[PDB]
Amino acid sequence: DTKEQRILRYVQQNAKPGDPQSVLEAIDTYCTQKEWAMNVGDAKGQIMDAVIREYSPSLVLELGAYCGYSAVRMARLLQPGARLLTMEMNPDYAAITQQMLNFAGLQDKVTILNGASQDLIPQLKKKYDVDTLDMVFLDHWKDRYLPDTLLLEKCGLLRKGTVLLADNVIVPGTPDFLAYVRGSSSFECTHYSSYLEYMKVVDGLEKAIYQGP
Numbered sequence: 001d002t003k004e005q006r007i008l009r010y011v012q013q014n015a016k017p018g019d020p021q022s023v024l025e026a027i028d029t030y031c032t033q034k035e036w037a038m039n040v041g042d043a044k045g046q047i048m049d050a051v052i053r054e055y056s057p058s059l060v061l062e063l064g065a066y067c068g069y070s071a072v073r074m075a076r077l078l079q080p081g082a083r084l085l086t087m088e089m090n091p092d093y094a095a096i097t098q099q100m101l102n103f104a105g106l107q108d109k110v111t112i113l114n115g116a117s118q119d120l121i122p123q124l125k126k127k128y129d130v131d132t133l134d135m136v137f138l139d140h141w142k143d144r145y146l147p148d149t150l151l152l153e154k155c156g157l158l159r160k161g162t163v164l165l166a167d168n169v170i171v172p173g174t175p176d177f178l179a180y181v182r183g184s185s186s187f188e189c190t191h192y193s194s195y196l197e198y199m200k201v202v203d204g205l206e207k208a209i210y211q212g213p
């Protein structure tokens with residue numbers, strides 16, 4: 001089997017069903033002790049939690065679910081009735097994420113869309129009845145951060161106050177996105193220095209709050 005299947009199996013055998021905190025702990029233990037994986041991790045995860053708690057977003061979009069770690073992290077802090085949509089183009093990973101969410105008992109709060117973000121984002125308004133997004137977590141291919149930001153704005157999915165939170169702005173890095181949001185009068189940006197998941201390597205998150213056109 002694959003690393004991702006091993007992680008799902010480990011969660012299933014080392015966490016309590018319906019207990020998201022135990023699911024996160026199990027994944028963090030697996031990835032620290034057994035096999036590294038590109039989950040946001042606990043160091044950056046704590047920053048994410050602090051952000052989610054500040055803004056209490058009613059609708060969050062996540063680009064790049066992977067195994068569902070960040071989806072569990074975010075969805076567990078959502079208020080009753082609040083929703084997370086997560087896009088994942090790799091069907092194998094989309095299946096892992098759905099199963100991870102089911103195990104955590106968060107399946108009613110999250111929808112996992114199996115496709116490419118550039119194909120699905122234009123469908124959000126008409127097919128998924130989205131008006132605007134309250135928050136967007138960017139954690140997919142790093143060269144897609146800027147193009148999907150620009151696509152979200154073209155699609156009318158951003159509103160004044162929409163929070164963009166971007167992983168890996170240092171490693172692997174997202175130089176074009178970072179330069180763009182920091183230079184644009186349409187974003188107010190904050191850098192949160194942290195560490196690469198499960199590693200003593202500097203990384204960080206960038207928060208970019210959309211200010212309108």
Ligand SMILES: Cc1ncnc2c1ncn2[C@@H]1O[C@H](/C=C/CNC(=O)c2cc(-c3ccc(F)cc3)cc(O)c2O)[C@@H](O)[C@H]1O
Pocket residue numbers: 038039040063064065066067087088089090093115116117118139140141142144167168171172196197
């Ligand atoms: C257009 C589109 N649409 C839908 N899903 C999409 C999508 N593009 C990608 N995806 C999905 O998102 C995930 C992939 C995320 C890419 N993340 C990283 O590559 C990543 C890498 C590291 C890393 C750091 C140091 C290293 F030495 C090696 C790797 C750390 C990270 O935290 C990363 O996130 C993966 O699940 C992929 O299918």
Ligand SMILES: [Cl-]
Pocket residue numbers: 038039040041065066067068069070071
């Ligand atoms: Cl993750």
Ligand SMILES: [Cl-]
Pocket residue numbers: 140141142143172
């Ligand atoms: Cl990438």
Ligand SMILES: [Cl-]
Pocket residue numbers: 181182187188189190
């Ligand atoms: Cl700024």
Ligand SMILES: [Cl-]
Pocket residue numbers: 040041042043044196197198199
């Ligand atoms: Cl960590």
Ligand SMILES: [Mg+2]
Pocket residue numbers: 038039040139167168
């Ligand atoms: Mg990442």
